[PDB]
Nucleic acid binder design. Structure first.
Lengths: 109, 97, 83, 95, 102, 95, 120, 83, 97
DNA sequence: ATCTTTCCTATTGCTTTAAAGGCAGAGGACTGTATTGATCAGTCCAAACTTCTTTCTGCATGTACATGGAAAACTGGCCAAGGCAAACACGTCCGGAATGATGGTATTTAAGAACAAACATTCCCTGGTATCAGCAAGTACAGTGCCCTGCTGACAGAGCAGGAGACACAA
DNA sequence: TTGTGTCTCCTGCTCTGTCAGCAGGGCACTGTACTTGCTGATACCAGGGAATGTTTGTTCTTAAATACCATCATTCCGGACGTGTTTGCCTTGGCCAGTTTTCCATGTACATGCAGAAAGAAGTTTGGACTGATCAATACAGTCCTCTGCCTTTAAAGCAATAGGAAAGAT
C-alpha cells in the first residue's frame, strides 16, 4: 500500500513550502519544465533571507523595548545592515520612516 | 521678557521629532482630493479604493522625503544650509528625471 | 462633483514637515511652488499607469494592486499594500 | 467567504519563532514580509528563466537557482544563501 | 591765428546747438572746431583733453548713445534742457552762475 | 553545419527603403537596430505577460499588446503606435 | 486543392514578419497561448517604431551629408527627440556619442575691458 | 602570466579626455584617483556577473553576450553587440 | 614672444572635439589588461572574446561620461568650474551608487 | 558660571485593539507508474583565441612658467525663523444608496495539435560607390596691442564783484 | 575852502584752462585650429544563385473567453461637532550674496622615450555538432492532510497624567 506521505519541506528540513514554490514556478511561465531540486533550493534561500531579516528586526524591536516587530523595526534592520540595504535599495517600506540622520554642519556651534 | 529660541534650534528639534516618527505628514483629505482631481483627466467617474489612496500617499511622501534628502545634500554642497529651487532642480536632473 | 484647484491643498506646513524628515534645517520661500510642481508631475505619472491597468481589466475601481504595479513598473517598489 | 488568498504568513512566523522564540510580529509588518518574499521569489525566478533561455535549456534546475542567487544577493549574503541552498538540496537528495 | 575769444563751454554749446540733430560725438566736435578755427588745427592733445575734461565735469552736457549702430564708435553729447542761454550776450569766456542740477 | 543566425536585418532594410529610398545603413547600425527591435519586443512581451498574469489571462491577445504599448511608450508614440497596430489588425481581419 | 499561400505579413500589409513574431512569442514562455491578432499588432508597432527612428536617423544623416545611417545618426535622432530619448533613456549605443552641449556658465567671459592676461 | 598593477593603465590624459566629453572644463588634481577607484568598482561589479554567466554556461570563454546580459542586469542596456 | 592660449580656451576646444567624435578614449590594451586582471579574482585561466572586451570598454566609457557630466553639473552648482572629488562623491551618492 | 524656562524622556494606570490560538474543510500537495523528451558522455574539428616577434610612430610622462579660479575675510540687508491669535478645515463617526466586482451557467468562438507542401530566409559569390587617408585652400575665432573716450583730483590763472583811496560835487 | 558821494585800483571769491593720472570700452592685426574641397584607394554594402527549416493551409477539438443574471460589499456622498492645524502678522537675527585680496594649483606648451597597435605567424584551446545512452520530468489517477477563513481570548501598545532630568538662552 501507499506509504506515509511526507512533505518535501520535511525532507529538505526547511520551514518554507517546497510544494507551493514548485507550483508557483510552474504556473509562472518561467520555463517549460522545472527541476526537482530547484524548488527546494529556492525555498531554502527564501527561508534564509527571511530568517536574516527577522533576526535583525527582532534585535531592533528589543532595542526599542517592543516585543512585536513593526514596519519601523523592519526599516531599521534593513537600513542599518549594509548588505540588506544594498539588496532593498529601491524598495519603499510602508510606515517605515527614515533612519535618524542630521548632517554635521547643521548642528549648533 | 518672553522666552525665544534662537533661529535654527526649533528646526533641529523638529528634524529630530519627525525623523523619529512614522506617521504621514500630509493631510489625508486634501491629498485624496488632489488624487481625484488628477485622475479625472484620464477617465471620468473613476472609483477608488481607500488602500489605493493610502498607497499613493505613501509613495508620494517617500519620494518627496528622498528628494529633500538629496536637496539638502545639494544645498550643503554649495556651502549653504538653506534649500532653494535650484537644489531640487539639480537633484532631479542628476537623479535622471 | 468636479474638482478644480486642490494642488494648493499641499500646504506650506506639510512641505515643511516633509523637508524636516529629510534633514532640512532652513527652507527658502520659493521651495513650496517647486515642490507642488514636482509632486503633481509624480502623481500624474503614477496615476496614468494605475488608470491604464484599471482600464485593461475593464474595471472602474483603481485598486491598491494597480497602484503597486504602476509604482513597481517605474522602479519605486512598495511593500505593504502588495497583497 | 471570498476566494482563498495565499501568503507566507505562517512560514515567516515559523522562521520568527526559530530565530526569536519570544517575539511576535504585526499584520502590517507581516504583509511587508510577504511582499519581500514575493519580490525575492520573482527576482530569482526571472533570473533563472533568463539563464535557462540564454543557454537554450528547457528546464530550471537547482543550478539555475544557484546562479540566480549568486547574481542577485550581494556579498556574504549570497554565499550564505548558497550554502543553505546546497545543504537543503543535499538533505533532500538523501530522501 | 590768435586764440578765439570763446570758452570751451561756449564752444561746446555752439557745436551742440548748430548741429542739425542737436548732438555730436567727440570726433565730430573736434572736426567742427578745427574747421571753424584753424588755430585749433594744431596742438590737438591739449584742447582735446580739455574738452573731454569739460564734458566730464560740467553738468550742462549729457551723453547720448547711437541707436542703429551708425558709423559707430564714440558717444553723442547733448545740452541739458535746463542749461538755457548761459553763454549768450557776450559772456563767452565766463558763464555767470554756472548751471547745476540742484 | 553551423546553426542559422536569424535577425530582423532584411525587414529593417525594407522599412528603411520605404521611408528613405536613397539612404543606406551600415552593418553596425543594422546591428544596433536589431538589438533595439529585440529590446522593444522583450519589453512589450514581458509587460503583456505581466498584464495577463495580473488578470489571470492565459492568452496574450492584441489587447494586452495595446495596453503594454500604452504603458511603455511615452506621449505621441503611445498614440501613433496604437493607431498603427489597430489599423494593421483591422486590415488583417478584413482578409 | 489547397489555395495559394499568402504570408500574414502580406495580409496585414506590414513589412515585419508576423510569423516570426508569433514564434518568438510562443517560444519565450510569455504566456501559455498567443492570440492570432497579437503577432499582427506587435509587428505593426515594431515596424512603426523602426520607421520613426529610421526617418529621424535619415534626417540626421542628410544633415551630416552622409547617405548611410551609422550609429552616430541613431544616437542623434534618439537624443534630439524628447519621446525617443525618454523611451531609450537608460540605453547605451555602441560607437555613438553625446549631444553637443556645453553649459553656458563655462563659456568664456566677453569682458568689455579686454587687455593682456594678468593676475586676478 | 599574473597581472598586478594595471589600474594605472587608466592614464591621466585618458581621464581628462573622458571628462572633456562630459563638458568638463577644469579638472582638479585629485580627480584621477577617485575616477580610478570608481572605474575599478564598476568593472568589478560588471565582470563578476559576466564571469557568473560564463560559469553557469560551463564555458571558459567570456563572450559578448555574457557582458551584455551582465550590463542589462544592472540597468545599463547596451546596443550593438548582439543583445 | 611665443604664442600661448589663455587657460580655458584649450579646454573648451577639447570639449568641442570630444563631444563631436565617437572614438574610444581609453587605450585598448591597458584596459584589456585591467579586465583580465580583475577577472582573475573570480575565476582563473579565463579567455575573453574580442567583442566581450569591446563591450566592456564601451559600457565603462559611457558610464564615466555620464558620471563626469553629473560631476560638472555639481561643480557648476557650487559656483565653481573645477571638478573635485566632492563633486564625484555627491553625484554618485544622489544616483544611489 | 549660575539661574530661568522649555522641552524631552520615563513611570504608572487604564483601555482598546490587534495578534495568538482553536476548529473546519477543501483544494492542492504527495505517491506510484509509464512515457518521453530532455540532458549527459564521448569524439572531432575548425575557428576562435592566446602567445610571441617586430615596427613605428603617436601617445603619456616629465618639466617649467604663470594665470586666474578657489578660498578666506568682511559687511550688510533682507530673507526666513520664532511666536501669537483667529479662523477654518481637517479629523472622526454615522448613515443612505448606488455602484460594480465577483460568482455561476450556457455557449460560442478562437487557438493548440498534427501533417504536408512550399516558400521565405540564411549563406555564399560578384560590381561600384560611399567612405577613409592625405594635402591643401579658406574661414573662424582668440590674443592682445593699441587707440579713443570718461572721470578725479589737484594745480594754475584769468573774470567780475566788493571795499578803500583819490577825485570831484555840493555848499 | 570843508564835508561827502562816486570813480578807479586793488583784492577776493568764482569760474575756467591745464595737467597728470587711472579706468572702461572698442578696433584691427597676428596666429593657430577647424572645415571644406580634391584625388586616390579600399573596403564594404547591395544584387544574384543554392540550401534548409519554418511558415501556411486544412481539420479536429477543447478550453478560454463572452454574455446574461444575481448578489453583496464597498465606495461615494452628505451631515455634524471638536479641536488641531493653518494663515496672516510682527520682530529680529544670522545667513546669503556681493566685494576684495592672496597665492597656489591648476592649465598650456615643449622635450623625450616607450609601449600600443597592427600585421603576421604558430600553438593551442574549446564551443558546438553529432551520436547514442540514460535519467529525470510530465501525465494521470487516487487520496489525505496542510493551509486559509472564521471566530474567540488576552496582552502589547496607545493614551492620559504626572514627575524628573537635559538643555537652550540670558545675565
Amino acid at each position: 500500500a501507499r506509504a506515509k506521505a511526507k512533505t518535501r519541506s520535511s525532507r529538505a528540513g526547511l520551514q518554507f513550502p517546497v510544494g507551493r514554490v514548485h507550483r508557483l514556478l510552474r504556473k509562472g511561465n518561467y520555463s517549460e519544465r522545472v527541476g526537482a531540486g530547484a524548488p527546494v533550493y529556492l525555498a531554502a534561500v527564501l527561508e534564509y533571507l527571511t530568517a536574516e531579516i527577522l533576526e535583525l528586526a527582532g534585535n531592533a524591536a528589543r532595542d526599542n523595548k517592543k516585543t512585536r516587530i513593526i514596519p519601523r523595526h523592519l526599516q531599521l534592520a534593513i537600513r542599518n545592515d549594509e548588505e540588506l540595504n544594498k539588496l532593498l535599495g529601491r524598495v519603499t517600506i510602508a510606515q517605515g520612516g527614515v533612519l535618524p540622520n542630521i548632517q554635521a554642519v547643521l548642528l549648533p556651534k | 521678557k518672553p522666552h525665544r529660541y534662537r533661529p535654527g534650534t526649533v528646526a533641529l528639534r523638529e528634524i529630530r521629532r519627525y525623523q523619529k516618527s512614522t506617521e504621514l505628514l500630509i493631510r489625508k483629505l486634501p491629498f485624496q482630493r488632489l488624487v481625484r482631481e488628477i485622475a479625472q483627466d484620464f477617465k471620468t467617474d473613476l472609483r477608488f479604493q481607500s488602500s489605493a489612496v493610502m498607497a499613493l500617499q505613501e509613495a508620494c511622501e517617500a519620494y518627496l522625503v528622498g528628494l529633500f534628502e538629496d536637496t539638502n545634500l545639494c544645498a550643503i554642497h554649495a556651502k549653504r544650509v538653506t534649500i532653494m529651487p535650484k537644489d531640487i532642480q539639480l537633484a532631479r536632473r542628476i537623479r535622471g528625471e | 462633483k468636479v474638482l478644480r484647484d486642490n494642488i494648493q491643498g499641499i500646504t506650506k506646513p506639510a512641505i515643511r514637515r516633509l523637508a524636516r524628515r529629510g534633514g532640512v534645517k532652513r527652507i527658502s520661500g520659493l521651495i513650496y511652488e517647486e515642490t507642488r510642481g514636482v509632486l503633481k508631475v509624480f502623481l500624474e505619472n503614477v496615476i496614468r499607469d494605475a488608470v491604464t491597468y484599471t482600464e485593461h481589466a475593464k474595471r472602474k475601481t483603481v485598486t491598491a494592486m494597480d497602484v503597486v504595479y504602476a509604482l513597481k513598473r517605474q522602479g519605486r517598489t512598495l511593500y505593504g499594500f502588495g497583497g | 467567504k471570498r476566494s482563498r488568498k495565499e501568503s507566507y504568513s505562517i512560514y515567516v512566523y515559523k522562521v520568527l519563532k526559530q530565530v526569536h522564540p519570544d517575539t511576535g510580529i504585526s499584520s502590517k509588518a507581516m504583509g511587508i514580509m510577504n511582499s519581500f518574499v514575493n519580490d525575492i521569489f520573482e527576482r530569482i525566478a526571472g533570473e533563472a528563466s533568463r539563464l535557462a533561455h540564454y543557454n537554450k535549456r528547457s528546464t530550471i534546475t537547482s543550478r539555475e537557482i544557484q546562479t540566480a542567487v549568486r547574481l542577485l544577493l550581494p556579498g556574504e549574503l549570497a554565499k550564505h544563501a548558497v550554502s543553505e541552498g546546497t545543504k537543503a538540496v543535499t538533505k533532500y537528495t538523501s530522501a | 591765428h590768435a586764440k578765439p575769444p570763446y570758452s570751451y563751454i561756449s564752444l561746446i554749446t555752439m557745436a551742440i546747438q548748430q548741429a542739425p540733430s542737436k548732438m555730436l560725438t567727440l570726433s565730430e566736435i573736434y572736426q567742427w572746431i578745427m574747421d571753424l578755427f584753424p588755430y585749433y588745427r594744431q596742438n590737438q592733445q591739449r584742447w582735446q583733453n580739455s574738452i573731454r575734461h569739460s564734458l566730464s565735469f560740467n553738468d550742462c552736457f549729457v551723453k547720448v548713445a547711437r541707436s542703429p549702430d551708425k558709423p559707430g564708435k564714440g558717444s553723442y553729447w547733448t545740452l541739458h534742457p535746463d542749461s538755457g542761454n548761459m553763454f549768450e550776450n557776450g559772456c563767452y569766456l565766463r558763464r555767470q552762475k554756472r548751471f547745476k542740477c540742484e
